[PDB]
Amino acid sequence: SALFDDIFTVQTVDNGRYNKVSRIIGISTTNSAIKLTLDINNEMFPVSQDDSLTVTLANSLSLKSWRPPKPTDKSLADDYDYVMFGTVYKFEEGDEDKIKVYVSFGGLLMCLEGGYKSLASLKQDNLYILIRR
Amino acid sequence: EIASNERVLIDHNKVLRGLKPKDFSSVAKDCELRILKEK
Amino acid sequence: FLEKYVAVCQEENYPILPEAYLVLSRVYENKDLNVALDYLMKANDILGDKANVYVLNNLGIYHFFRNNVSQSSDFFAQSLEALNNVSPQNKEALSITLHYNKARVEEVSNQSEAEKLYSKLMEKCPGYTSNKIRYIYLLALKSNGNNYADVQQLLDDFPSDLEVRSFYGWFLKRYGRKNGLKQDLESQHHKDTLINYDKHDCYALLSLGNIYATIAREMKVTDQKQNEIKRQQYLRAAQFYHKVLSIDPKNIYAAQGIAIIFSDKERTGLALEIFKKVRDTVQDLGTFINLGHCFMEAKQFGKAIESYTIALEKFSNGMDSKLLVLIGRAWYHRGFYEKSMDAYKKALEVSEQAYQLSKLPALRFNIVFIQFQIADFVKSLPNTQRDLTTLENALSGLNDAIKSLLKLAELEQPPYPSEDLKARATMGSNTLRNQLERAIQDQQDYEMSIQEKLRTARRKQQLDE
Amino acid sequence: DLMDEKNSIKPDVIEYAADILGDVELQKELNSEYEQLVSDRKFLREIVFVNGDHNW
Amino acid sequence: RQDYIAKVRYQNDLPAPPCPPKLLKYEIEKEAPQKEFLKDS
């Protein structure tokens, strides 16, 4: 079902030029050297410095034309506060245990740096990012 | 007088919530539908 | 209304009454401790020298919940200093309360001063219950639960106290086999507590559910009737957990028991979801151990390895042998199902470290089994996928495993029968050793052929030049 | 170079990585390719584009 | 079945009671001081 789970602490929140988009940098509590850079929508999911986020990555939401979800049906997204859908445009096989995954959620960019052991399963075309706080 | 003056910050049932509570109502509903109503 | 009152007073430049801030802090106690602490600090700043013992004590407790040990200690010291100005009627009660709080801070810091203040308060006021509970709990920790008489006496003193009964049940669950008491004695105690005192106590219900789950798990299954009785015990435990959830749907332990029952019922997905939610809620050693177990049942061996490693580093600090056993088992499973040699090497190294920490026959047999599997896997591998060094290490491990099998067969009570050990050692020594030597010879021939080709090519190149 | 093992084609990119080292006819083909590339480099760098411009 | 020896035991043991320090009620948390304060002229 899911491909990756972890808990991060936000080191920095960079608003920059934009009013609705912020770039956050986080590091996994359990396993260091696993970094996360992510663009999020401030209005619908505001985050502050030193917050704790539960980030989950999945290739599907189950338990081609989009339609508004019926209230009756249920999906993985019901457990989280913020869900995005993107495409992986670069899977970098770099150093011995340095793997970078670049995802683009409609122009909102994410880079997940980590080891091959954790990120081996992230070699997909599309990914969902589910965030809980 | 001590018992009247004493107040406890968190309740006996609510002690598992603490500073961050979470809801498992869906988990309870699934447990009821799949254990008590299990066939 | 209080926020509007504060805003109107600020616009009118009028002195804000600190009582409104105290009421706001009391209301926010059940909603937001941060806002309550901020309002209490504002009230203290407004009062200045008019600060009372209650405000300082609540500030100290707020910083204690905020893990601000230094600030909590300073606020408690200021409260103790201001205690001298208390009216004599409530002076004894407030002194007892402040001494209890100071003893709690000591119990966090150093147990000796906590025991001293506990003895002082017990002589001052024997009727208080929390003091006796904490003192007997520290005595049980120091004496490794050799004070069952004290626990029984405390139970007799306050049979109607829910806290005393819960502590007594916790002591029973901790040292029932050590004290040789009845298995169902705690069950009858919790049943009496629920029937006669309070049927909505989640602690006794969870204790009964755990006891019933243990009884069902230890119950032998022989036919459909025994399975039905075990399912009935699990249904009783699930009814206890569902009653707990009805009392409070935010109970992590009830969900944990439900997930354990689902794991016993092989409902791996629901247990995995519940354990992930629990890990998101709270992070202790047990949650990580259950997550690793579920990942092993869910065949996600890499996530199990990560979960066990995080558990060991966070809590066990590389000292517990059981987590090392789990790490070795997970690595062996990943290596077996994925045909990876490095997983076998890591499992062997972890098992060797665990044995050097313990030196037990079970880990000796684990090392022997791991080395036998290593030799079998290397022999099954082609020549192009292995080298001479791996063959030599596998052969040496095979020799050490055969010697250790002979050693285990000479023991008093080995984990497996000595006949099986001798038969497996003979079966390995007859065939696997010779197959390893043939593999070594083939690998040597392959390397020699490569070197012959490499040396012959260069001479022809030089002749052409 | 098919002789030196650390200056050859990687083994995870080709399925025939085993029976490739030591060949001489294939090494001759690779040398012919490299000599042609060196001739092209000399030609472009010395006759056609002398200032090093390479975006055309 | 001669294989790796490992024991699986789920840990759901209830912790000991924490017995946290008790809050002290304010003067305005008692009915009689409330009656005195609200009836102020």
XYZ file of C-alpha atoms in Angstrom:
734
model
C 0.000 0.000 0.000
C 2.418 2.654 1.255
C 6.010 2.963 0.064
C 7.676 5.163 2.715
C 6.826 6.565 6.148
C 8.810 8.745 8.564
C 8.538 11.707 10.948
C 10.339 14.998 10.279
C 11.104 18.211 12.165
C 11.022 21.458 10.195
C 14.358 23.264 10.355
C 13.437 26.246 8.172
C 10.361 27.760 6.540
C 11.188 29.910 3.508
C 8.279 31.970 2.201
C 10.377 33.814 -0.393
C 8.577 35.724 -3.121
C 5.297 33.817 -2.819
C 2.389 34.538 -0.494
C 0.717 31.109 -0.673
C 3.703 28.753 -1.127
C 6.453 27.970 1.392
C 9.526 25.742 1.171
C 10.233 23.634 4.265
C 13.361 21.621 5.077
C 13.119 18.643 7.406
C 15.188 15.778 8.777
C 13.912 12.397 9.949
C 13.844 11.954 13.723
C 14.590 8.224 13.609
C 17.216 8.081 10.843
C 19.426 11.005 10.226
C 20.897 12.029 6.883
C 17.370 11.624 5.434
C 16.446 15.141 4.321
C 13.177 16.450 2.908
C 12.623 19.642 0.927
C 9.020 20.378 0.019
C 6.772 23.134 -1.322
C 3.369 23.340 0.373
C 0.295 25.561 0.230
C 0.302 27.942 3.212
C -3.426 28.734 3.109
C -4.656 25.151 3.399
C -1.810 23.683 5.502
C 0.211 26.260 7.456
C 3.340 24.970 9.190
C 5.686 26.644 11.658
C 9.325 26.158 12.599
C 10.190 23.036 14.654
C 6.835 21.382 13.949
C 6.597 17.595 13.679
C 5.091 16.160 10.494
C 4.220 12.587 9.541
C 5.115 12.230 5.857
C 3.929 9.165 3.934
C 4.528 8.312 0.271
C 2.285 5.973 -1.702
C 1.734 5.022 -5.330
C -2.026 4.632 -4.787
C -4.797 5.697 -2.420
C -6.947 2.557 -2.612
C -7.393 0.200 0.327
C -8.648 7.596 -15.603
C -10.802 10.724 -15.548
C -10.913 12.362 -12.124
C -14.239 12.966 -10.405
C -15.170 14.464 -7.013
C -15.071 11.732 -4.362
C -18.378 10.339 -3.165
C -18.844 10.529 0.633
C -19.595 6.788 0.770
C -16.238 5.606 -0.576
C -13.113 5.620 1.588
C -9.417 5.883 0.799
C -6.007 6.222 2.437
C -6.360 10.030 2.297
C -9.001 10.029 5.075
C -6.296 9.620 7.750
C -4.211 12.655 6.717
C -4.607 16.428 6.543
C -2.748 17.217 3.302
C -2.510 15.068 0.159
C -0.745 15.888 -3.115
C -0.199 14.004 -6.376
C 2.927 14.410 -8.491
C 5.277 12.851 -11.018
C 8.841 11.663 -10.457
C 11.074 13.401 -12.994
C 14.486 12.317 -11.643
C 15.708 9.283 -9.688
C 19.366 9.966 -8.930
C 21.589 6.936 -8.310
C 24.450 8.920 -6.821
C 26.984 7.889 -4.184
C 27.201 4.573 -2.303
C 24.185 5.385 -0.117
C 23.075 8.836 -1.345
C 19.805 8.636 -3.301
C 17.844 11.693 -4.442
C 14.227 11.526 -5.619
C 12.743 14.579 -7.347
C 8.948 14.850 -7.549
C 6.854 17.663 -9.043
C 3.331 18.222 -7.686
C 2.083 20.420 -10.511
C 5.095 22.713 -10.188
C 5.526 22.317 -6.421
C 8.858 20.541 -6.085
C 10.079 17.956 -3.585
C 13.516 16.408 -3.057
C 13.886 13.409 -0.746
C 17.523 12.619 0.066
C 18.273 9.313 1.732
C 19.799 5.875 1.586
C 19.102 3.174 -0.988
C 17.580 0.886 1.680
C 14.696 3.243 2.470
C 14.139 4.790 -0.978
C 14.582 1.672 -3.148
C 10.816 1.307 -3.618
C 10.346 4.943 -4.729
C 11.237 4.163 -8.375
C 7.745 4.889 -9.679
C 6.189 7.194 -12.244
C 3.723 8.898 -9.884
C 3.582 9.325 -6.115
C 1.129 10.610 -3.531
C 2.477 12.475 -0.504
C 0.234 12.223 2.552
C 1.044 14.577 5.433
C -0.399 14.479 8.948
C 0.059 16.882 11.851
C -9.558 20.137 52.485
C -6.667 18.627 50.495
C -9.098 16.645 48.316
C -11.212 19.757 47.708
C -8.144 21.857 46.844
C -6.419 19.176 44.736
C -6.884 19.304 40.968
C -5.311 16.917 38.452
C -4.350 18.345 35.057
C -5.276 15.271 32.997
C -8.071 12.787 33.612
C -7.754 9.061 34.315
C -9.227 8.094 30.942
C -7.728 11.126 29.157
C -4.153 10.492 30.404
C -3.317 8.796 27.086
C -4.190 12.018 25.231
C -1.828 14.372 27.059
C -0.787 17.375 24.992
C -1.705 15.686 21.676
C -4.976 13.730 21.391
C -5.911 11.533 18.448
C -9.183 9.856 17.489
C -9.602 6.120 16.852
C -13.364 6.204 16.226
C -12.894 4.575 12.810
C -10.740 1.882 14.448
C -13.476 1.236 17.031
C -16.136 1.052 14.299
C -14.027 -1.396 12.266
C -13.415 -3.503 15.389
C -17.164 -3.606 16.098
C -17.941 -4.537 12.481
C -15.198 -7.184 12.218
C -14.956 -8.844 15.656
C -18.306 -8.515 17.431
C -20.142 -8.900 14.102
C -17.613 -11.408 12.724
C -19.170 -14.469 11.089
C -16.295 36.790 26.336
C -13.007 36.928 28.269
C -11.046 37.705 25.085
C -13.541 40.474 24.274
C -13.188 41.796 27.845
C -9.384 41.813 27.492
C -9.618 43.633 24.143
C -12.056 46.250 25.507
C -9.860 46.834 28.578
C -6.767 47.229 26.378
C -8.590 49.723 24.137
C -9.793 51.647 27.209
C -6.308 51.503 28.859
C -7.815 50.017 32.035
C -6.104 47.518 34.396
C -6.959 43.998 33.247
C -8.192 41.838 36.120
C -5.841 38.836 36.582
C -8.829 36.701 37.653
C -9.961 36.609 34.014
C -6.506 35.291 33.083
C -6.759 32.623 35.806
C -10.191 31.565 34.501
C -8.825 31.466 30.934
C -5.913 29.288 32.077
C -8.318 26.945 33.896
C -10.473 26.634 30.762
C -7.468 26.126 28.459
C -6.067 23.394 30.765
C -8.216 20.897 28.844
C -7.565 22.564 25.459
C -4.086 24.147 25.211
C -1.452 24.099 27.963
C 0.640 26.691 26.084
C -2.114 29.334 26.054
C -2.919 28.619 29.717
C 0.757 28.995 30.680
C 1.045 32.248 28.704
C -2.070 33.677 30.380
C -0.790 32.598 33.806
C 2.556 34.306 33.110
C 0.709 37.479 32.071
C -1.348 37.310 35.283
C 1.833 36.869 37.345
C 3.432 39.873 35.618
C 0.298 41.946 36.317
C 0.258 40.908 39.996
C 3.987 41.444 40.551
C 4.502 41.093 44.301
C 0.867 39.936 44.723
C 1.704 36.435 43.419
C 0.149 33.628 45.465
C 1.143 30.034 46.188
C -1.450 28.585 43.773
C -0.201 30.605 40.780
C 3.435 29.642 41.410
C 2.529 25.970 41.903
C 0.525 25.899 38.658
C 3.408 27.594 36.810
C 5.792 24.968 38.185
C 3.476 22.136 37.127
C 3.116 23.732 33.665
C 6.894 23.850 33.254
C 7.103 20.277 34.582
C 4.734 19.139 31.819
C 6.779 21.283 29.403
C 9.937 19.417 30.603
C 11.404 22.791 31.685
C 13.134 21.303 34.729
C 15.081 24.462 35.639
C 12.107 26.838 35.371
C 9.824 24.393 37.209
C 12.402 24.100 40.004
C 12.660 27.901 40.239
C 8.864 28.281 40.375
C 8.618 25.566 43.048
C 11.337 27.334 45.064
C 9.413 30.619 44.805
C 6.235 28.787 45.866
C 8.041 27.324 48.895
C 9.333 30.803 49.770
C 5.823 32.287 49.458
C 4.419 29.419 51.576
C 5.596 31.334 54.679
C 2.917 33.988 53.989
C 0.049 31.466 53.857
C -2.709 31.680 56.472
C -2.257 29.037 59.230
C -5.555 27.234 58.497
C -4.567 26.082 54.991
C -0.812 26.221 55.708
C -0.479 22.527 56.614
C -2.431 21.345 53.553
C -0.532 23.596 51.142
C 2.789 22.596 52.743
C 1.902 18.916 52.235
C 0.961 19.597 48.596
C 4.164 21.564 47.899
C 6.305 18.895 49.586
C 4.580 16.239 47.453
C 5.341 18.249 44.298
C 8.973 18.753 45.376
C 9.236 15.016 46.068
C 7.901 14.377 42.554
C 10.595 16.660 41.098
C 13.184 14.779 43.173
C 11.796 11.416 41.979
C 12.408 12.680 38.458
C 15.912 13.832 39.453
C 17.230 11.712 42.360
C 15.264 9.024 44.212
C 17.045 9.501 47.570
C 15.614 12.965 48.291
C 12.254 11.744 46.970
C 12.268 8.894 49.503
C 13.304 11.324 52.261
C 10.422 13.709 51.507
C 8.070 10.717 51.132
C 9.017 9.537 54.633
C 8.613 13.085 55.986
C 5.130 13.424 54.469
C 4.128 9.920 55.595
C 5.065 10.790 59.177
C 3.339 14.167 58.747
C 0.206 12.732 57.092
C -0.207 8.935 56.921
C -3.686 9.299 55.391
C -2.453 10.493 51.993
C -2.528 7.768 49.338
C -0.333 8.984 46.450
C 2.650 9.378 48.805
C 2.342 5.758 49.963
C 1.795 4.528 46.381
C 4.924 6.282 45.094
C 7.043 5.257 48.102
C 6.023 1.591 47.799
C 6.628 1.789 44.027
C 10.181 3.076 44.590
C 10.731 0.367 47.225
C 9.519 -2.254 44.732
C 11.927 -0.905 42.101
C 14.830 -0.929 44.571
C 14.032 -4.377 46.029
C 12.949 -5.935 42.669
C 9.398 -6.499 43.929
C 10.190 -8.121 47.290
C 7.651 -5.967 49.185
C 4.430 -7.845 48.375
C 3.420 -7.546 52.047
C 3.602 -3.743 51.784
C 1.490 -3.799 48.597
C -1.105 -6.051 50.264
C -1.175 -3.778 53.330
C -1.663 -0.736 51.071
C -4.532 -2.537 49.320
C -6.115 -3.270 52.714
C -5.720 0.378 53.808
C -7.594 1.794 50.786
C -9.753 -0.911 49.150
C -11.937 1.773 47.524
C -9.054 3.762 45.995
C -8.839 3.144 42.246
C -5.174 4.215 42.165
C -4.202 1.789 44.958
C -6.010 -1.094 43.235
C -4.429 -0.247 39.863
C -0.956 -0.153 41.446
C -1.636 -3.481 43.189
C -2.766 -5.021 39.897
C 0.336 -3.656 38.164
C 2.515 -5.226 40.875
C 0.626 -8.520 40.459
C 1.105 -8.479 36.673
C 4.789 -7.643 37.183
C 5.694 -10.291 39.785
C 2.955 -12.943 39.887
C 5.252 -15.758 38.778
C 7.994 -14.504 41.115
C 5.612 -14.448 44.092
C 3.939 -17.725 43.086
C 0.442 -16.284 43.477
C -2.673 -17.488 41.671
C -2.939 -16.598 37.984
C -6.636 -15.710 38.309
C -6.182 -13.785 41.590
C -5.558 -10.548 39.679
C -8.520 -11.436 37.440
C -10.852 -11.826 40.433
C -9.438 -8.628 41.971
C -10.159 -6.635 38.801
C -13.596 -8.263 38.470
C -14.421 -7.252 42.056
C -13.138 -3.730 41.340
C -15.327 -3.429 38.235
C -18.467 -4.951 39.781
C -18.400 -3.278 43.200
C -16.537 0.026 42.728
C -16.490 1.295 39.122
C -17.383 -0.595 35.938
C -16.026 2.224 33.726
C -12.369 1.981 34.802
C -10.351 1.421 31.625
C -7.284 0.179 33.542
C -9.019 -2.859 35.055
C -10.771 -3.610 31.750
C -7.446 -3.529 29.874
C -5.851 -5.716 32.565
C -8.677 -8.263 32.246
C -8.349 -8.167 28.460
C -4.607 -8.825 28.698
C -5.175 -11.708 31.146
C -7.856 -13.236 28.894
C -5.607 -12.838 25.834
C -2.766 -14.572 27.698
C -5.119 -17.407 28.720
C -6.351 -17.803 25.127
C -2.801 -17.751 23.721
C -1.524 -20.315 26.237
C -4.589 -22.510 25.624
C -3.775 -25.521 23.454
C -5.716 -25.926 20.196
C -6.652 -29.502 19.279
C -9.972 -29.266 17.421
C -12.748 -26.843 16.473
C -14.126 -26.718 20.034
C -10.816 -25.498 21.493
C -10.520 -22.918 18.706
C -14.071 -21.774 19.504
C -13.209 -21.422 23.211
C -10.059 -19.451 22.314
C -12.147 -17.232 20.021
C -14.644 -16.733 22.867
C -11.831 -15.599 25.182
C -10.599 -13.237 22.453
C -14.194 -12.010 22.043
C -14.363 -11.263 25.778
C -11.056 -9.371 25.577
C -12.312 -7.480 22.512
C -15.509 -6.595 24.390
C -13.349 -5.206 27.210
C -11.336 -3.154 24.692
C -14.522 -1.965 22.959
C -15.948 -0.898 26.327
C -12.699 1.028 26.917
C -13.058 2.695 23.500
C -16.689 3.530 24.316
C -15.466 5.216 27.514
C -12.689 6.968 25.578
C -12.013 6.482 21.835
C -8.476 7.902 22.282
C -7.101 4.794 24.033
C -3.879 3.597 22.399
C -3.627 0.438 24.532
C -7.110 -0.810 23.577
C -6.194 -0.426 19.902
C -2.897 -2.202 20.623
C -4.774 -5.131 22.161
C -7.142 -5.187 19.172
C -4.128 -5.275 16.828
C -2.590 -8.121 18.859
C -5.862 -10.075 18.559
C -5.903 -9.384 14.799
C -2.309 -10.638 14.553
C -3.422 -13.781 16.396
C -6.324 -13.926 13.908
C -3.879 -13.250 11.006
C -5.518 -9.902 10.154
C -2.161 -8.355 9.320
C -3.348 -5.222 7.502
C -5.572 -3.886 10.288
C -2.883 -4.582 12.899
C -0.298 -2.821 10.708
C -2.540 0.243 10.311
C -3.272 0.350 14.059
C 0.419 -0.025 14.957
C 1.381 2.746 12.518
C -1.269 5.014 14.068
C 0.033 4.157 17.561
C 3.616 4.926 16.465
C 2.374 8.259 15.107
C 0.739 8.848 18.506
C 3.409 7.626 20.950
C 6.921 6.206 20.478
C 8.061 3.504 22.907
C 10.018 0.257 22.557
C 6.905 -1.937 22.469
C 5.366 -0.135 19.488
C 8.551 -0.548 17.429
C 8.799 -4.228 18.430
C 5.179 -4.809 17.369
C 5.793 -2.938 14.099
C 8.812 -5.137 13.388
C 6.804 -8.278 14.173
C 3.965 -7.151 11.891
C 6.413 -6.292 9.087
C 7.868 -9.792 9.467
C 4.329 -11.176 9.170
C 3.719 -8.786 6.244
C 6.985 -9.955 4.556
C 8.369 -6.377 4.563
C 11.729 -7.490 5.914
C 13.626 -4.267 5.166
C 11.142 -2.158 7.125
C 11.364 -4.730 9.934
C 15.167 -4.342 9.945
C 14.824 -0.552 10.096
C 12.200 -0.718 12.871
C 14.294 -3.101 14.983
C 17.420 -0.970 14.460
C 15.556 2.202 15.485
C 14.145 0.404 18.545
C 17.583 -0.888 19.586
C 19.336 2.468 19.128
C 16.576 4.556 20.719
C 15.893 2.390 23.778
C 18.060 -0.722 24.128
C 21.311 1.095 23.129
C 22.752 -2.144 21.747
C 22.343 -4.087 25.005
C 19.210 -6.222 24.583
C 19.859 -9.640 23.048
C 16.243 -10.171 21.928
C 16.295 -7.240 19.492
C 19.595 -8.543 18.085
C 17.901 -11.935 17.599
C 15.052 -10.189 15.761
C 17.543 -8.271 13.578
C 19.346 -11.503 12.699
C 16.075 -13.277 11.889
C 14.889 -10.402 9.675
C 18.234 -10.251 7.846
C 18.179 -14.033 7.366
C 14.627 -13.877 5.976
C 15.552 -11.071 3.559
C 18.661 -12.958 2.429
C 16.708 -16.195 2.003
C 13.830 -14.710 0.000
C 15.992 -12.281 -2.025
C 19.178 -14.414 -2.481
C 21.460 -11.737 -1.013
C 24.823 -12.716 0.482
C 25.403 -9.413 2.317
C 22.204 -9.992 4.304
C 23.626 -13.360 5.402
C 26.926 -11.699 6.369
C 25.124 -9.028 8.412
C 22.931 -11.654 10.114
C 26.008 -13.746 10.956
C 27.816 -10.684 12.348
C 24.804 -9.678 14.479
C 24.430 -13.254 15.768
C 28.156 -13.371 16.590
C 27.920 -10.096 18.538
C 24.820 -11.359 20.373
C 26.601 -14.614 21.254
C 29.659 -12.691 22.490
C 27.235 -10.714 24.664
C 25.418 -13.820 25.961
C 27.172 -17.152 25.107
C 23.976 -19.218 25.031
C 23.354 -22.567 23.261
C 20.374 -21.125 21.353
C 22.525 -18.466 19.687
C 25.192 -21.115 19.052
C 22.586 -23.141 17.140
C 21.492 -19.944 15.369
C 25.094 -19.337 14.243
C 25.369 -22.964 13.070
C 22.104 -22.736 11.110
C 23.142 -19.397 9.571
C 26.529 -20.813 8.525
C 24.897 -23.944 7.062
C 22.477 -21.764 5.076
C 25.430 -19.608 3.958
C 27.331 -22.678 2.736
C 24.250 -24.034 0.937
C 23.523 -20.680 -0.739
C 27.154 -20.178 -1.817
C 27.289 -23.736 -3.195
C 24.025 -23.129 -5.081
C 25.467 -19.911 -6.542
C 27.264 -20.061 -9.910
C 31.011 -19.550 -10.219
C 30.606 -16.134 -11.884
C 28.549 -14.853 -8.919
C 31.092 -15.797 -6.216
C 34.830 -15.729 -5.497
C 37.463 -17.759 -3.642
C 37.311 -15.619 -0.478
C 33.581 -16.249 0.045
C 34.151 -19.978 -0.546
C 36.964 -20.081 2.035
C 34.902 -18.164 4.610
C 31.912 -20.458 3.999
C 34.098 -23.564 4.381
C 35.627 -22.269 7.633
C 32.149 -21.428 8.920
C 31.031 -24.937 7.964
C 33.880 -26.480 9.982
C 33.122 -24.267 12.993
C 29.404 -25.070 12.668
C 30.078 -28.829 12.630
C 32.312 -28.508 15.713
C 29.674 -26.399 17.473
C 26.993 -28.958 16.539
C 29.094 -31.668 18.194
C 29.490 -29.345 21.201
C 25.714 -28.756 21.412
C 25.033 -32.507 21.150
C 27.137 -33.023 24.307
C 25.062 -30.530 26.320
C 22.447 -31.374 28.936
C 19.328 -29.719 27.456
C 20.007 -28.441 23.913
C 17.242 -26.468 22.141
C 16.901 -29.323 19.622
C 17.427 -33.077 20.177
C 21.045 -34.241 19.968
C 20.127 -36.972 17.465
C 18.897 -34.295 15.044
C 22.099 -32.286 15.601
C 24.288 -35.330 14.907
C 22.244 -36.302 11.835
C 22.439 -32.787 10.380
C 26.185 -32.589 11.096
C 26.772 -35.961 9.403
C 24.595 -34.998 6.412
C 26.477 -31.728 5.982
C 29.926 -33.277 6.426
C 29.330 -36.099 3.933
C 28.171 -33.985 0.967
C 28.280 -30.202 1.497
C 32.004 -30.081 2.332
C 32.913 -32.003 -0.832
C 30.593 -29.830 -2.935
C 32.307 -26.754 -1.468
C 35.739 -28.158 -2.390
C 34.546 -28.859 -5.953
C 33.215 -25.287 -6.138
C 36.620 -24.031 -4.942
C 38.373 -26.068 -7.650
C 36.017 -24.754 -10.355
C 36.521 -21.166 -9.150
C 40.309 -21.636 -9.234
C 40.111 -23.016 -12.785
C 37.913 -20.089 -13.874
C 40.334 -17.516 -12.413
C 43.295 -19.313 -14.020
C 41.538 -19.282 -17.411
C 40.874 -15.537 -17.046
C 44.527 -14.886 -16.168
C 45.731 -17.031 -19.088
C 43.559 -15.054 -21.524
C 44.759 -11.741 -20.055
C 48.432 -12.730 -20.313
C 48.086 -14.140 -23.843
C 46.282 -11.070 -25.241
C 49.044 -8.591 -24.336
C 51.782 -10.583 -26.092
C 49.815 -10.609 -29.363
C 49.163 -6.870 -28.980
C 52.907 -6.278 -28.540
C 53.674 -8.436 -31.599
C 51.233 -6.397 -33.711
C 52.825 -3.177 -32.427
C 40.227 -0.695 -22.469
C 39.268 -4.374 -22.312
C 42.479 -5.388 -20.497
C 42.562 -3.149 -17.417
C 39.543 -4.070 -15.306
C 38.938 -0.628 -13.760
C 38.974 1.173 -17.142
C 36.457 -1.020 -18.978
C 32.709 -1.112 -19.529
C 30.774 -1.489 -16.276
C 29.482 -5.012 -15.530
C 25.933 -4.005 -14.549
C 25.177 -2.283 -17.882
C 25.887 -5.264 -20.183
C 24.661 -8.854 -19.932
C 27.832 -10.150 -21.649
C 30.198 -8.608 -19.070
C 31.920 -11.930 -18.330
C 33.255 -13.040 -21.726
C 34.482 -9.561 -22.720
C 37.895 -9.147 -21.042
C 40.927 -10.373 -22.959
C 39.522 -10.136 -26.491
C 41.895 -8.757 -29.123
C 39.712 -8.394 -32.229
C 37.197 -6.391 -30.190
C 40.055 -4.380 -28.686
C 41.216 -3.673 -32.249
C 37.713 -2.426 -33.132
C 37.691 -0.169 -30.057
C 41.164 1.146 -30.919
C 40.010 1.924 -34.471
C 37.042 3.863 -33.051
C 39.302 5.791 -30.664
C 41.804 6.633 -33.424
C 38.945 7.916 -35.593
C 37.759 10.085 -32.680
C 41.300 11.430 -32.163
C 41.540 12.235 -35.888
C 38.199 14.074 -35.668
C 39.410 16.026 -32.620
C 42.632 17.011 -34.416
C 40.732 18.021 -37.572
C 38.125 20.165 -35.791
C 40.601 21.737 -33.369
C 43.303 22.550 -35.940
C 41.583 23.275 -39.288
C 37.889 24.072 -38.884
C 37.385 25.779 -35.503
C 40.656 27.126 -34.116
C 39.277 29.254 -31.256
C 37.467 26.312 -29.654
C 33.887 27.288 -30.534
C 31.775 24.134 -30.664
C 28.133 25.324 -30.756
C 27.224 25.510 -34.444
C 11.881 -28.074 11.970
C 15.499 -27.229 12.830
C 15.742 -23.526 11.968
C 16.516 -20.164 13.578
C 15.393 -19.825 17.201
C 13.387 -16.666 17.910
C 10.496 -15.810 20.229
C 7.610 -13.468 19.397
C 5.851 -11.803 22.343
C 3.810 -8.637 21.844
C 4.361 -6.014 24.552
C 1.133 -4.398 25.778
C 2.005 -4.102 29.464
C 0.245 -1.251 31.231
C 2.645 1.281 32.790
C 2.692 2.166 36.461
C 0.512 5.132 37.552
C 2.373 8.426 37.074
C 0.915 10.266 40.090
C 1.649 13.783 38.762
C 1.829 16.858 41.021
C -1.633 18.181 41.821
C -2.794 21.620 40.711
C -3.976 24.068 43.364
C -7.407 25.595 42.848
C -7.586 29.384 42.707
C -9.486 31.481 45.224
C -12.004 32.151 42.426
C -12.501 28.389 42.036
C -14.474 28.265 45.316
C -18.136 29.271 45.512
C -17.963 31.618 48.525
C -15.115 33.850 47.180
C -17.006 33.932 43.861
C -20.098 35.152 45.723
C -18.012 37.782 47.528
C -16.317 38.947 44.307
C -19.386 39.126 42.042
C -21.494 40.955 44.662
C -18.877 43.744 44.909
C -20.210 47.304 44.826
